[PDB]
Amino acid sequence: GYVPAVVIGTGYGAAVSALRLGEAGVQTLMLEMGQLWNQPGPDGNIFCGMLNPDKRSSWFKNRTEAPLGSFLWLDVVNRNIDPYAGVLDRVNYDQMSVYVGRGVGGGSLVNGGMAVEPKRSYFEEILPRVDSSEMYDRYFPRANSMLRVNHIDTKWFEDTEWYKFARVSREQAGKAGLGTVFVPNVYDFGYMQREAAGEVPKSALATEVIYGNNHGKQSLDKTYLAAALGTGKVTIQTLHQVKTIRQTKDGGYALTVEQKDTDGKLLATKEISCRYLFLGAGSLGSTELLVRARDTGTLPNLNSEVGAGWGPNGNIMTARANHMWNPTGAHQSSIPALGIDAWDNSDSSVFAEIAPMPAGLETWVSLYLAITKNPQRGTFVYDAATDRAKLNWTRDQNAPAVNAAKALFDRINKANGTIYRYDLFGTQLKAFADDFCYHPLGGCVLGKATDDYGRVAGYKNLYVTDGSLIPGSVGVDPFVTITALAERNVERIIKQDV
Ligand SMILES: Cc1cc2nc3c(=O)[nH]c(=O)nc-3n(C[C@H](O)[C@H](O)[C@H](O)COP(=O)(O)OP(=O)(O)OC[C@H]3O[C@@H](n4cnc5c(N)ncnc54)[C@H](O)[C@@H]3O)c2cc1C
């Protein structure tokens, strides 16, 4: 039925939006297509780990997959599974696979927790219509506080076997003149210490992250969404996927919403209507809803910019083979702590996460997730035949990202006399994974598909809140930027529209 505000999804944009709506007294319903992850499974844990994947690992696939970079060591643990409403969805497009979370909390359930503010001068370049002073003065600090960002104890970091992998890359990078930075996180680093001491159940130190963390990680269900529920004005319905959006004849918006079980069986189709409609379905999900609505004629006044301007945050994965005297360790925390910041806003810019690997024995490999500045963009194009958005991105559009990553890591290899690994990303020789994305950005870009606060052009009381707003790149891990921009946007929307 009717409810004043509906929020589609429960990731970062959605969670911020719902909390502030509820605090403003607006009764709000959040619709999430995945599960509320709170039921102990067959091992007594909510989530499966990376060395024991099961159906919970995967959104409707029939076989588990190894985390990218890890196939050579983790294919042995893969198994056939029944298609199930699991937590991590590998979404396959023509020449790009985008990985997204599915559940109450969205990507916050599956991500590495890295909570980083973009460089102000880069923010100013990518979003020149946005007042950067309020972002840096007000909204970024608010986001970091609410998200419960915290910082690793450097003495513990320096001492612990669980971060040897990070220290090895730091030393190697330093021989090339390259520096590292500590990366703040939403994973409780005090908890992580006690894990190493054998004092509390392990999660990051038990090879968990990408299928969820049973402990330690402050995903959005614990932070913004808990607070939203606490207002008394917000509820969350799960296993509810919004399919269509239209503008009702008498005002407001109406949604068709499918309710499924965890096996994917359709239980019901419901119409839900509202006064205020907020899209927080992610870069992929929000954009799909809007291209569908435009091209099927249910939101005919959407503009041509809906679908445009997508990029993978310049994501490239690569790996180096260490010398035999530089082992990375059998025990690697699943939460990154250091990055290589070689980001100067030029086209050679790279911000690289020093990524753990989950094998649990010594491999001598250093793994990196590079974030680059690549101007190429893709477009989501509605396919009416299959009722799907398709992402028009081709692999050659990642050549600038590969080139930037390669130039940086070539400097490190030259300084150390090391070589790449070529075998971590399939049988063909391939040192740079260039057809995945963890950080999808764009599709409904701020100021192009929307006004400067995410109001969808052509419509009143229709808002986009999430990664689809970002113009393809932020130069850092994106969730803090999504969160801060959503804080800015919803405040203003409530003040002027609600
Ligand atoms: C492996 C991995 C590692 C990452 N590591 C980091 C990191 O360390 N730091 C960082 O900053 N970022 C990281 N990210 C990226 C980060 O998680 C995303 O940028 C962020 O979650 C995007 O937030 P969002 O609000 O746009 O959407 P999401 O968090 O993707 O949330 C969208 C939600 O909407 C739901 N949904 C979608 N369509 C519908 C629909 N039609 N109806 C109902 N519900 C719908 C989804 O199921 C989901 O719960 C990582 C991501 C992955 C996958």
XYZ file of C-alpha atoms and ligand atoms in Angstrom:
551
model
C 0.000 0.000 0.000
C 0.872 3.647 0.631
C 3.701 4.949 2.770
C 5.029 8.554 2.741
C 8.575 7.725 1.656
C 10.006 4.639 0.026
C 13.736 3.968 -0.221
C 14.804 1.317 -2.734
C 17.785 -0.644 -1.463
C 19.709 -0.567 1.814
C 23.300 0.380 0.835
C 25.104 3.591 1.710
C 22.895 6.108 -0.118
C 19.747 4.406 1.025
C 20.827 4.057 4.664
C 21.794 7.701 5.035
C 18.567 8.795 3.360
C 16.356 6.611 5.569
C 18.011 7.691 8.803
C 17.534 11.388 8.061
C 13.968 10.873 6.794
C 13.095 9.024 9.975
C 14.656 11.694 12.145
C 12.538 14.270 10.243
C 9.394 12.285 11.165
C 8.758 10.868 7.672
C 7.457 7.296 7.837
C 9.764 5.425 5.491
C 9.750 1.898 4.014
C 12.996 0.450 2.696
C 12.682 -2.311 0.098
C 15.681 -4.672 -0.132
C 15.867 -7.507 -2.645
C 18.352 -9.519 -0.544
C 18.186 -10.951 2.946
C 18.498 -9.561 6.445
C 21.690 -11.439 7.407
C 20.998 -12.527 10.927
C 20.267 -16.288 10.859
C 22.953 -18.763 11.929
C 23.618 -21.188 9.133
C 24.660 -24.856 9.071
C 28.080 -24.018 10.591
C 26.532 -21.864 13.292
C 27.720 -18.665 11.549
C 25.726 -16.121 9.556
C 28.249 -15.891 6.719
C 30.540 -18.427 5.049
C 34.295 -17.724 4.933
C 36.491 -17.643 1.875
C 37.927 -21.103 2.510
C 34.467 -22.698 3.121
C 32.162 -21.055 0.520
C 28.639 -22.434 0.259
C 25.315 -21.173 -1.140
C 25.462 -18.167 1.204
C 28.447 -16.886 -0.787
C 26.597 -16.302 -4.034
C 23.517 -14.571 -5.418
C 21.802 -17.196 -7.524
C 24.783 -19.093 -8.999
C 25.205 -22.866 -9.226
C 28.884 -23.012 -8.244
C 31.022 -21.026 -5.811
C 33.908 -18.993 -7.173
C 37.319 -18.105 -5.850
C 37.963 -14.489 -4.881
C 39.705 -12.686 -7.733
C 43.446 -13.297 -7.548
C 43.017 -16.478 -5.493
C 41.891 -19.155 -8.021
C 45.260 -20.972 -7.952
C 44.838 -21.712 -4.192
C 41.054 -21.481 -3.569
C 39.575 -23.336 -6.591
C 40.134 -26.524 -4.518
C 37.448 -25.388 -2.049
C 34.852 -24.553 -4.726
C 31.682 -26.604 -4.819
C 28.376 -26.879 -6.585
C 25.591 -25.030 -4.781
C 21.885 -24.548 -5.128
C 20.940 -21.070 -6.503
C 20.152 -19.095 -3.384
C 19.775 -15.497 -2.164
C 23.460 -15.326 -1.099
C 25.393 -12.226 -0.249
C 27.765 -11.502 -3.165
C 26.531 -11.029 -6.726
C 28.889 -11.191 -9.700
C 26.845 -9.364 -12.352
C 28.122 -10.329 -15.833
C 27.887 -7.833 -18.669
C 29.293 -8.198 -22.158
C 32.946 -7.244 -21.253
C 32.720 -6.377 -17.563
C 31.782 -8.244 -14.368
C 30.560 -6.024 -11.543
C 30.496 -7.386 -7.991
C 27.826 -6.045 -5.649
C 26.392 -6.944 -2.249
C 22.863 -8.274 -1.841
C 21.244 -7.877 1.548
C 20.329 -5.418 4.254
C 23.397 -3.170 4.113
C 24.263 -3.710 0.454
C 27.944 -3.623 -0.365
C 28.777 -2.804 3.248
C 28.261 -6.529 3.949
C 30.944 -7.680 1.505
C 33.398 -4.810 1.175
C 36.877 -4.425 2.657
C 35.779 -1.660 4.993
C 38.275 0.918 3.655
C 36.918 4.338 4.540
C 38.809 7.055 2.651
C 38.005 10.699 1.803
C 38.922 11.662 -1.748
C 41.537 14.325 -2.406
C 39.783 17.685 -2.245
C 41.346 18.940 -5.435
C 40.133 15.791 -7.222
C 36.623 16.169 -5.752
C 36.631 19.735 -7.083
C 37.633 18.426 -10.557
C 34.980 15.706 -10.769
C 32.047 17.713 -9.249
C 32.718 21.358 -10.036
C 29.093 22.378 -9.378
C 29.251 21.138 -5.720
C 30.363 23.395 -2.838
C 33.484 21.642 -1.669
C 33.709 23.592 1.589
C 30.548 22.121 3.083
C 31.645 18.658 1.968
C 34.980 18.879 3.726
C 33.788 21.030 6.669
C 30.539 19.239 7.451
C 29.492 16.170 5.456
C 32.729 14.162 5.299
C 33.209 14.446 9.084
C 29.584 13.494 9.709
C 29.964 10.422 7.508
C 33.143 9.281 9.181
C 31.607 9.556 12.619
C 28.348 7.758 11.755
C 30.149 5.005 9.843
C 32.310 4.351 12.928
C 35.560 4.758 11.013
C 38.586 3.887 13.118
C 42.354 3.645 12.719
C 44.726 0.715 13.222
C 47.191 0.788 16.146
C 50.504 1.358 14.355
C 52.602 -0.511 16.946
C 50.343 -3.542 16.600
C 50.401 -3.227 12.826
C 54.218 -3.122 12.828
C 54.542 -6.213 15.057
C 51.792 -8.579 13.972
C 52.246 -11.505 11.625
C 48.804 -10.708 10.172
C 50.154 -7.605 8.365
C 53.537 -8.889 7.157
C 52.094 -8.846 3.658
C 51.517 -5.119 3.947
C 54.962 -4.359 5.333
C 56.607 -6.305 2.488
C 54.847 -4.192 -0.163
C 55.644 -1.035 1.792
C 59.348 -1.847 1.737
C 59.274 -2.775 -1.950
C 57.366 0.355 -2.887
C 59.746 2.496 -0.857
C 62.713 1.333 -3.009
C 60.898 2.885 -5.985
C 60.359 6.179 -4.186
C 56.695 5.393 -3.510
C 54.997 5.978 -0.211
C 52.269 4.247 1.697
C 49.365 5.511 3.814
C 47.341 3.873 6.539
C 43.767 3.369 5.370
C 40.989 3.967 7.962
C 38.345 1.246 8.181
C 34.959 0.374 9.584
C 36.306 -2.958 10.822
C 36.969 -2.574 14.595
C 40.797 -2.693 14.826
C 40.609 -3.129 18.606
C 38.530 -6.254 17.969
C 41.077 -7.339 15.370
C 43.882 -7.165 18.022
C 41.910 -9.351 20.363
C 41.373 -11.784 17.480
C 45.164 -12.110 17.076
C 45.478 -12.657 20.840
C 42.947 -15.480 20.768
C 40.550 -13.462 22.933
C 37.495 -13.194 20.662
C 36.125 -15.141 17.681
C 38.093 -14.534 14.524
C 36.653 -13.051 11.371
C 39.216 -10.866 9.554
C 41.874 -13.264 10.954
C 39.840 -16.318 9.813
C 39.779 -15.553 6.112
C 36.364 -13.773 6.058
C 35.435 -10.602 4.216
C 33.963 -10.925 0.719
C 31.048 -13.181 1.787
C 30.526 -11.148 4.951
C 32.259 -10.895 8.311
C 30.735 -12.776 11.236
C 32.478 -10.384 13.635
C 34.304 -7.040 13.755
C 33.069 -5.259 10.608
C 30.673 -2.356 11.204
C 28.493 -2.828 8.179
C 25.541 -0.492 7.688
C 23.096 -2.774 9.515
C 25.036 -1.914 12.678
C 25.457 1.813 12.013
C 23.097 3.901 9.851
C 20.364 1.252 9.442
C 20.265 0.412 13.166
C 19.944 4.135 13.847
C 17.225 4.454 11.155
C 15.224 1.661 12.764
C 15.801 3.386 16.125
C 13.887 6.496 14.963
C 10.617 4.516 15.101
C 9.792 5.820 11.599
C 11.603 3.299 9.364
C 10.947 -0.301 8.480
C 12.785 -2.657 6.145
C 11.205 -5.344 3.988
C 13.539 -7.962 2.605
C 13.451 -10.267 -0.399
C 11.436 -7.444 -2.056
C 12.753 -6.353 -5.465
C 11.329 -3.232 -7.091
C 10.640 -3.927 -10.772
C 8.849 -0.856 -12.119
C 8.320 2.776 -11.166
C 5.564 5.067 -12.430
C 4.177 8.475 -11.574
C 0.582 7.891 -10.171
C -2.294 9.801 -11.670
C -3.076 11.537 -8.391
C 0.395 12.310 -7.282
C 3.416 10.535 -6.174
C 4.948 7.240 -7.284
C 3.781 3.650 -7.547
C 6.034 0.597 -7.619
C 5.553 -3.005 -8.639
C 7.485 -5.083 -6.108
C 8.220 -8.817 -6.280
C 8.460 -10.803 -3.072
C 10.547 -13.942 -3.377
C 11.774 -16.643 -1.035
C 15.489 -17.428 -0.630
C 15.234 -20.025 -3.419
C 14.029 -17.319 -5.765
C 10.445 -18.499 -5.968
C 7.969 -15.675 -6.648
C 5.599 -15.436 -3.681
C 3.688 -12.276 -4.540
C 3.677 -9.136 -6.663
C 2.568 -6.031 -4.735
C 1.894 -2.419 -5.621
C 3.457 0.061 -3.127
C 2.972 3.799 -3.476
C 4.487 6.871 -1.892
C 4.885 10.612 -1.839
C 8.696 10.619 -1.868
C 10.734 8.054 -3.741
C 14.489 7.584 -3.071
C 16.571 5.241 -5.208
C 19.460 3.577 -3.352
C 19.713 0.436 -5.500
C 23.357 1.154 -6.427
C 25.038 2.257 -9.628
C 23.713 -0.882 -11.319
C 20.242 -1.115 -9.706
C 19.173 2.533 -9.683
C 20.308 3.061 -13.229
C 18.506 -0.074 -14.397
C 15.230 1.066 -12.797
C 15.429 4.450 -14.510
C 16.454 3.313 -18.035
C 13.634 0.756 -17.804
C 11.140 3.421 -16.676
C 12.209 5.784 -19.480
C 12.177 3.301 -22.318
C 8.978 1.399 -21.211
C 7.164 4.706 -20.904
C 6.431 4.744 -17.178
C 8.733 7.766 -16.498
C 8.681 9.218 -20.022
C 10.150 12.582 -19.001
C 13.534 11.160 -17.927
C 16.386 12.710 -19.827
C 19.001 11.294 -22.164
C 21.666 11.374 -19.469
C 19.967 8.548 -17.561
C 22.203 5.533 -18.200
C 25.319 7.549 -19.138
C 28.619 8.211 -17.527
C 29.444 4.853 -15.942
C 32.976 3.904 -14.933
C 34.595 1.243 -12.790
C 36.551 3.696 -10.593
C 39.563 2.766 -12.717
C 39.712 -0.633 -10.977
C 42.576 -2.916 -12.054
C 43.972 -5.894 -10.115
C 47.609 -7.016 -10.442
C 50.163 -9.031 -8.557
C 53.930 -9.216 -8.104
C 56.066 -12.278 -7.366
C 58.289 -11.527 -4.342
C 61.834 -12.716 -3.909
C 62.159 -15.868 -1.820
C 63.581 -13.743 0.996
C 60.383 -11.625 1.126
C 57.597 -13.998 2.096
C 54.228 -12.325 2.611
C 53.079 -14.796 5.249
C 50.599 -17.644 5.587
C 48.484 -15.504 7.982
C 47.121 -12.389 6.268
C 44.334 -10.291 7.757
C 41.456 -10.135 5.287
C 41.100 -6.379 5.888
C 43.596 -4.128 4.104
C 45.439 -1.590 6.191
C 47.903 0.163 3.783
C 47.703 1.665 0.366
C 50.214 3.127 -2.089
C 49.064 6.730 -2.807
C 50.578 7.821 -6.109
C 47.577 9.977 -6.973
C 48.393 13.458 -8.225
C 45.251 14.001 -10.363
C 47.307 13.476 -13.521
C 46.553 10.635 -15.900
C 49.382 8.614 -14.307
C 47.584 8.687 -10.981
C 47.229 5.445 -8.997
C 45.886 4.762 -5.512
C 46.581 1.047 -4.851
C 45.247 -1.051 -2.022
C 47.800 -3.579 -0.751
C 45.400 -6.500 -0.786
C 45.648 -9.625 1.369
C 45.453 -12.952 0.003
C 43.427 -15.729 1.528
C 45.423 -18.869 0.671
C 46.627 -19.487 4.162
C 49.987 -20.764 3.073
C 53.001 -18.977 1.736
C 52.721 -17.970 -1.895
C 55.193 -15.083 -2.111
C 52.534 -13.087 -3.955
C 51.741 -9.427 -3.400
C 48.269 -8.471 -4.655
C 47.048 -4.966 -5.454
C 43.756 -3.311 -6.327
C 44.661 -0.195 -8.308
C 42.370 2.787 -8.593
C 43.255 4.856 -11.688
C 42.146 7.910 -13.669
C 40.706 6.676 -16.968
C 38.320 9.031 -18.785
C 36.519 6.207 -20.662
C 32.844 5.795 -19.767
C 30.160 3.248 -20.540
C 26.424 3.538 -20.939
C 23.580 1.385 -19.690
C 21.145 0.696 -22.554
C 17.729 -0.857 -21.891
C 17.046 -4.140 -23.616
C 13.258 -4.368 -23.865
C 13.468 -7.962 -25.105
C 14.965 -9.287 -21.850
C 13.812 -6.378 -19.651
C 17.387 -5.736 -18.567
C 19.829 -2.887 -18.660
C 22.943 -3.912 -20.591
C 26.283 -2.078 -19.935
C 27.915 -0.925 -23.135
C 31.533 -1.117 -21.937
C 34.265 -2.845 -23.939
C 37.496 -4.237 -22.434
C 39.655 -1.965 -24.590
C 38.068 0.977 -22.695
C 40.157 -0.168 -19.693
C 43.443 0.229 -21.620
C 44.225 3.611 -19.979
C 43.632 2.099 -16.518
C 45.870 -0.884 -17.307
C 48.512 1.481 -18.705
C 48.530 3.634 -15.527
C 48.639 0.625 -13.191
C 51.397 -0.982 -15.268
C 53.517 2.159 -15.256
C 53.370 2.362 -11.457
C 54.063 -1.314 -10.761
C 56.788 -1.389 -13.471
C 58.630 1.176 -11.334
C 58.353 -1.103 -8.310
C 59.484 -4.138 -10.284
C 62.457 -2.200 -11.721
C 63.576 -0.983 -8.322
C 63.381 -4.510 -6.870
C 64.263 -6.822 -9.746
C 60.895 -8.567 -9.467
C 58.387 -9.685 -12.076
C 54.606 -9.848 -12.270
C 52.571 -12.970 -11.786
C 50.789 -13.836 -15.073
C 48.729 -16.812 -13.962
C 46.375 -15.523 -11.243
C 43.511 -14.404 -13.538
C 43.110 -17.418 -15.892
C 45.167 -19.604 -18.102
C 46.127 -17.005 -20.622
C 49.127 -14.884 -19.578
C 47.535 -11.856 -18.004
C 49.144 -9.711 -15.352
C 46.333 -7.099 -15.113
C 42.705 -8.023 -14.463
C 40.798 -5.497 -16.526
C 37.203 -6.764 -16.735
C 35.985 -6.652 -13.152
C 34.708 -3.844 -10.947
C 34.157 -3.623 -7.186
C 33.433 0.131 -7.315
C 30.785 0.837 -9.975
C 30.212 4.579 -10.291
C 27.771 6.492 -12.427
C 24.732 5.890 -14.612
C 22.671 8.654 -13.101
C 25.293 11.342 -12.710
C 24.865 14.259 -10.336
C 24.044 17.372 -12.368
C 23.449 15.466 -15.602
C 20.633 12.959 -14.955
C 19.772 14.821 -11.766
C 20.153 18.279 -10.241
C 23.075 18.930 -7.854
C 21.298 17.141 -4.968
C 20.180 13.989 -6.814
C 16.682 15.190 -7.768
C 15.904 13.313 -10.952
C 15.479 15.709 -13.873
C 11.931 15.887 -15.173
C 10.295 14.773 -11.898
C 9.428 16.164 -8.460
C 9.921 14.130 -5.282
C 12.051 11.557 -7.102
C 15.605 11.190 -5.870
C 18.760 9.131 -6.572
C 21.074 8.743 -3.595
C 23.867 6.329 -4.346
C 26.923 5.435 -6.411
C 25.003 6.041 -9.602
C 25.438 9.808 -8.887
C 29.269 9.732 -8.973
C 30.827 10.527 -12.399
C 32.770 7.289 -12.795
C 35.746 7.972 -10.556
C 36.663 9.239 -7.089
C 40.345 8.236 -6.924
C 39.880 6.321 -3.665
C 37.655 3.563 -2.255
C 34.196 5.141 -2.783
C 31.815 4.474 0.110
C 32.815 7.464 2.257
C 32.148 9.756 -0.703
C 28.773 8.089 -1.383
C 27.870 8.461 2.291
C 28.933 12.109 2.585
C 27.226 13.120 -0.622
C 24.048 11.378 0.580
C 24.261 13.289 3.859
C 24.483 16.553 1.903
C 21.687 15.633 -0.473
C 19.089 14.329 1.933
C 19.575 17.311 4.234
C 18.877 19.698 1.548
C 15.972 17.677 0.069
C 14.301 17.481 3.477
C 14.720 21.181 4.051
C 13.395 22.340 0.640
C 11.055 19.558 -0.507
C 9.668 17.623 2.446
C 34.508 -7.094 -3.029
C 34.192 -5.612 -2.780
C 35.072 -4.830 -2.097
C 34.904 -3.484 -1.820
N 35.776 -2.847 -0.976
C 35.493 -1.493 -0.697
C 36.191 -0.816 0.351
O 37.027 -1.390 1.105
N 35.883 0.483 0.527
C 35.012 1.203 -0.308
O 34.937 2.425 -0.134
N 34.244 0.527 -1.186
C 34.477 -0.759 -1.341
N 33.607 -1.451 -2.182
C 32.602 -0.673 -2.902
C 31.380 -0.336 -2.030
O 30.934 -1.472 -1.311
C 30.304 0.276 -2.915
O 30.874 1.415 -3.555
C 29.062 0.714 -2.099
O 28.535 -0.395 -1.400
C 28.036 1.310 -3.057
O 26.944 1.803 -2.248
P 25.532 2.106 -2.933
O 24.683 2.703 -1.881
O 25.704 2.796 -4.205
O 24.980 0.639 -3.323
P 25.075 -0.833 -2.703
O 25.856 -0.817 -1.455
O 25.481 -1.718 -3.825
O 23.588 -1.153 -2.251
C 22.474 -1.332 -3.195
C 21.460 -2.181 -2.448
O 20.232 -2.121 -3.228
C 19.694 -3.434 -3.363
N 18.938 -3.492 -4.586
C 19.378 -3.332 -5.876
N 18.412 -3.274 -6.764
C 17.248 -3.395 -6.010
C 15.881 -3.361 -6.385
N 15.493 -3.238 -7.660
N 14.984 -3.531 -5.411
C 15.401 -3.674 -4.142
N 16.657 -3.667 -3.682
C 17.536 -3.492 -4.688
C 20.911 -4.321 -3.354
O 20.600 -5.699 -3.118
C 21.808 -3.671 -2.321
O 21.615 -4.172 -0.991
C 33.732 -2.850 -2.344
C 32.801 -3.616 -3.009
C 32.970 -4.967 -3.238
C 31.897 -5.715 -4.015
